Write an enzyme that holds these catalytic residues in place. Structure first.
Site, PDB file in Angstrom:
ATOM      1  N   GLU D  44       1.231  -0.990  -0.145  1.00 49.55           N
ATOM      2  CA  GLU D  44      -0.146  -0.135  -0.242  1.00 49.55           C
ATOM      3  C   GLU D  44       0.927   1.102   0.073  1.00 49.55           C
ATOM      4  OE1 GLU D  44      -4.579   1.036   2.651  1.00 49.55           O
ATOM      5  OE2 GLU D  44      -2.430   0.693   3.370  1.00 49.55           O
ATOM      6  N   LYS D 126      -8.760   3.707  -2.375  1.00 48.26           N
ATOM      7  CA  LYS D 126      -8.947   3.528  -1.473  1.00 48.26           C
ATOM      8  C   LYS D 126     -11.283   3.893  -0.733  1.00 48.26           C
ATOM      9  CE  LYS D 126      -7.601   2.107   2.734  1.00 48.26           C
ATOM     10  NZ  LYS D 126      -6.368   2.405   4.050  1.00 48.26           N
ATOM     11  N   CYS D 160      -5.107  -2.282   3.116  1.00 50.74           N
ATOM     12  CA  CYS D 160      -5.464  -2.560   4.546  1.00 50.74           C
ATOM     13  C   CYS D 160      -6.522  -2.602   5.434  1.00 50.74           C
ATOM     14  CB  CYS D 160      -4.722  -1.392   5.847  1.00 50.74           C
ATOM     15  SG  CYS D 160      -4.869   0.171   5.346  1.00 50.74           S
TER      16      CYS D 160
END
Lengths: 316, 316, 316, 316, 316, 316
Positions: D44, D126, D160
């Site tokens: 990430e 995200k 995540c």
């Protein structure tokens, strides 16, 4: 339309062929309007004809007719039903059919009031068939206790035993009926052996309906013809179980007076009478079972008016 | 079309090989049409084969067959399925497959009715797998309780334990079904040790489905073969649990009478019977569970016909 | 009590004599209790006898039996009824009668479960007579689809064509029934000529009720006898319509297996089986149409348990 | 292609230089493809590096990194993105980049799946930055919950604590995902002081994504390094807040089993695993959250897949 | 009450005896209450014991346990249930049972939260049994996705593979749950050979439930014992499939960190942890799937909470 | 009511004690009503205080306040909210609170307008926290953009950098707002080192809201006290990040002019202004963003006013 002529059919059905039944109904629909009737009413089960073997035989003796009666049942909105529906427009006459309906797999003892524009005002089924007719037919609902607004006024129909049933006819009086079609089969079955199937009993049932409801009662009644017995009697022990004739059609006024000129028992024909809805005002001076004669402090009708269904489908 | 011949397969699946299963199915689809059958019906799970390890061992003993069942599952509209779709056109025969479907990675216990024009009338999933079949397959829903209009009449299908679920077959009767495909697996499992898997239990379940619906039940049934036991049996402890044979396919009339010739329990073949949708009128004179022989004042079915979806997409 | 012996009667009724019928009932209540059965089950309409003339003739041929069937109909709490009630108490056995009830002008096709201390657990009317039985009998309500807690577990009853009714048996399954009396008439009417009335059709329906319900089914069955035919047949046109014998009583376990040892078709007797309400947990590991083998997201039963009165007196 | 090697990177970023970042990514893309990996997955924010000052300083102590993080954010379809897009084609490997996107004024925590032919399968933001990441990044859309068909099968990515979002990963399972890139930062922040940022927590969240989804989870991970800490630790009150290492890259099978050989916490490398998309059918025997194990009669996901433009232009 | 000790049981059931099982429960309830625990959680199917024969043989090998499991299944509100109910009041402890419920004819995989005052806060059935557990159990419904206010905060329960169902646990998080009981059976089935059934897979599923939900997860876990295997293993082909031990009970904080001191795999014990509902405010800084970390413009849960009756009884 | 006095608080919160903070609010509510103010306005987050540690510390240095923020968050309709609600009635003043709401697991940056009748007009969550405030708080939605009819005219509220959001204040102007509460925290953070947090920037943003909207803008402002710093400073490297004071409360006319008497920066007090909703018609001669100065042929706002829920419950 405040005054008109009405017709009750006294005719033999084209027994167990739907298409000859439909063709003869078309000819009688034409003949009723040719004599000037604004309404014609047909006998009970008259397409393809009343299921007479149930009175003559065991269920086993009926089985040669069961497939034929099912394959010649008149579905509402079928091409043999539109032949009757268009014929009511093509002659500008209200038609009250009597027929065997089918839906999927069950026969129903049915009637349909067809408009001057040749469309259903309402189709109908018998609530309870009579004891051995319950082996041929299913049941109607309180949605078949219906009297309709038409150009001829408050028009309703019932068949045979539904004139004997008191709450079933009071449900029709409750709708302030003016003209009634009491459909009957031939009264040649069990002649002199069982009074409940006699013309004497069942013309009194229709005459008393005209007197209790204060409405004009057409009582169209079928007749059993010479050639129909050759299909339907197999032995001399069944000969006196169903005679030729049985046609005791009648028309009654709202005070139980007969309005029709007679026909003989074996005679095919149509009865005609003059209908004035203003005579119901005089006839209701004596009796009115849902107005001045009623005691809603003592007796009321509880009635499920809704059409019943075996399956409910959930909607998103 | 009201009179026609129909075919119920009694054949062993080409167990756990879909390309051999489809090849054998197209052979049997040809062989049914060569004998003049207008419909052919196949056993439950027949492509690639019914998952017999679930009856024979723990999940740990079944694991050697789980990737094989999944990789030989028949996805609807995949090329091995279109090979069966083209085979229904190539032989002008209605095909009613039974198969394992796959979608994503859930397997389903499935069926598909295919036109003689070679196109799907409906694919269809079992509403509830049987107690240990739940370790393999997912559920259908009310969209799988469907009877279809076809050239052959009101045509429907269910498989094994859905003949033992009364509301699930009331949903099929409420659709006025005429011909039914009751797909079954091989009754060679748990012989004498458990009766719910037997020929006598599940032939009674098919015979009663016919008698309750008044519709022609084709009951195709698989069979187990020596070279399938060689894949599927490893020890004498398992050898008692599943026999060679278990072919008890049947065909029943709407009166419940068996129309088929016998086949031996171990014999592969196709059963043939002459259908007449006209006979349903005689069978329906005695019982009709959604018509005259019903009580919509006492009992009704609620049914949610709508296909369930895990995720709904908001559309702008 | 979880384990007990049970009886299904196979006997000819003392046809149209209630005082011989009740004497014979009490004699079989004794024979069952003398073999050690905790429960004895009787055939359909066995007091005073099933109305076979409905199958053998027209209503006008039936007329000689109608007054005799009405006079020999058994009223609830009648002295002949209390005689049967005392006979259950006298012998410490549950008695499941099948009788013609009379209640007003209407006969009903009734059953009564009598407690081992001689009281009605239930008195219960068939919800729909079979097609020609409707010419003799009225109808029960959802009051009559009832299962009862008793010393013998959850106990219920239905008769003949009520096993051919998916909603009507789901209404019973939803009450978690453990033991069932599937009462039947003789299976010698229309031998070969109408399969729906045969032993194979109705032994399948009784076996499929045991298999769908996972409840022990006692199927007591009447038989026709020489001296019953000598009153009921008069010509060869009736002779093959009802044969001597027709006794196909059976008893089934909750997996559907036949627990009874056979009898001849012509033979009167009592069938017996050893019952274990523990075995229902084994059978209900496979199927439970109201538990793990059910989908309330897709299917439900709507049921009206209220008894239907014709008049509702306005309570002061 | 159903069987292939795949690579999860465990490498320190070239922290806050995009040009050394892209040179090191191409070095790793080359090293993964030389080993025969058909896919490589990156951590990430790995281009130009994960914004660690948010966990070590106030917004005032962070200011020295904001212009650098913005200057070195990767514009999609810019020259340094094209430099990676060409490196995917050059090596015939799928690349799943994790980067700081910049679009206009705003940064996004982003991923891009790049094809074997070196073109974007998708570029993906995200949906919700975690906690203090919301002080750096903006939100994605329902268009970022996308699973793509590829030469490698149904391929998707999340980063995540999107593996901690139950609806977000239900939206991915509903697309029948087979291989998944769970891209992570590095688990050396707040060692012992916060468990939600730990190796044990986020390796379990990745392992459970595989076990729940029945798909291969590649979980690449950064690692912190001496030359990164010497840019980012300036005081004693940070020396325990971010340690060197935190490389806990993993790869998991569809049953949840770890497929990777263990690297050390503080060692740079690439993890390799031999993927077999046939194995997903064994894993889907036990669990399938969108198929046989779902209950779409109880639970459903509503999802808006449409991307959220701030401004709509009327078109003439 | 916001700070309290809690107890998670790790003990073998008194396998297939409800009277010995309820005595062992009433002892472990008393043992947890003596240590100062305000809550005790029990394993999945712990009364009378989890059905391990499904994991070890075919249905035909399982038939020896089916009646024993049915006959020892715990009716809710029966005397052996009220014995546990009274033991909760008697010791002033909340009891979260896990047991094989029996309701009518069907088993359910069930849990019940009994209050400090010895009454049911909830009784609750698993929404979907795991793949071969479906060969023993029926499904719950949306009324089994419930979280309760108590003396102990928002309290809830799910069992084994319901932690693997993202919508089923979003339904729990949506109710703002503070303490969770994650009931498991022993993790000694298929050691090494199936990771989905392992301690490592399902300790991670419980950890990730705590980490996703920000609630304290008590994860009690059964254990297998010598005296349980002597009944349940007959040979080595089963001996390798279920080892002794499998006790991997855990307790987790709202951050996912393990709060329990370890036991050994075969050890019986009770794990104890000091719970502080104030800590949920700290753990919800990072993550909150139904609050600041959600996106209800992209993703929402549709849920049907209504209890699923098979029959609707029409009200008068 | 077209003319009245209004009050804007310039006061330090009782930092992280809700009970002490509500005592101080009830004191200030009384002090405004004693001056004859028909409305009082409170700063942003003022119960229990603005989360200043996010501008001073990393998340790890902030941990000592997260539980103390969450446990002193104000639930709406809880007792310390009812205490403020009764204080609005007790003094006959409109109260516009600014506070930290807690709903379930998540904090919100929130406001509540309370009537003279001591009841909520609306409670209202900030639509988007400012960049590091997003580490403390969740988002509101379009239901939080409401303007209300009151005794005082069209009354509306927003807080700090929602005055920096052009569509978010067009959404307020479109509702024809007349008096506005522009709640702010203290302006003593990052003095000189970040102008966006300054008095000059946010006094200008408040002044431009009044000028753009043609409404009276009450800008209440917090201020930072010595004993708030004593809890919130520890190292010298924070001593200049947040200073004493920062009270720059203002009240502005619909022409943008300051109506307030100047307090000093470091001084607690209440600002008072004479409001006259007649003056708005003179300010609306020049500008009207939603009326004569709009161009709805060029520009429109699309707005979703509807409240967002994470879960929807199916109702039967």
């Amino acid at each position: 339309k405040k005054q008109y002529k009405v017709a009750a059919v006294q005719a033999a059905p084209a027994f167990l062929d739907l298409e000859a039944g439909v063709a003869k109904a078309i000819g009688l629909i034409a003949q009723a309007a040719a004599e000037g009737a604004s309404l014609v009413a047909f006998p009970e089960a008259w397409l393809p004809g009343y299921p007479w073997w149930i009175w003559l035989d065991s269920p086993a003796g009926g089985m040669r007719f069961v497939q034929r009666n099912f394959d010649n049942a008149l579905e509402v909105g079928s091409e043999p039903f539109e032949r009757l529906c268009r014929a009511a427009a093509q002659h500008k006459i209200y038609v009250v059919l009597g027929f065997t309906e089918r839906s999927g797999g069950t026969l129903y003892l049915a009637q349909a009031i067809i408009d001057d524009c040749g469309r259903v005002v309402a189709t109908r089924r018998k609530l309870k068939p009579t004891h051995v007719e319950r082996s041929v037919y299913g049941e109607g609902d309180g949605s078949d206790l219906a009297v309709h607004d038409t150009t001829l006024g408050r028009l309703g129909a019932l068949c045979c035993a539904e004139h004997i049933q008191p709450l079933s006819k009071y449900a029709m009086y409750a709708q302030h009926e003016q003209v009634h079609i009491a459909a009957w089969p031939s009264f040649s079955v069990y002649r002199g052996a069982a009074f409940q199937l006699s013309a004497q009993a069942n013309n009194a049932a229709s005459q008393v309906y005209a007197l209790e409801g204060q409405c004009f009662v057409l009582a169209p009644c079928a007749t059993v013809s010479k050639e129909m017995l050759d299909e339907l009697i197999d032995s001399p022990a069944k000969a006196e179980l169903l005679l030729e004739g049985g046609g005791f059609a009648m028309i009654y006024g709202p005070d139980g007076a007969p309005l029709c000129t007679p026909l003989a028992e074996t005679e095919e024909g149509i009865l005609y009478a003059d209908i004035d809805l203003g005579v119901i005002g005089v006839a209701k001076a004596a009796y009115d079972p849902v107005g001045h004669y009623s005691r809603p402090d003592v007796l009321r009708l509880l009635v499920n008016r809704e059409p019943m269904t075996r399956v409910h489908y959930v909607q998103p």
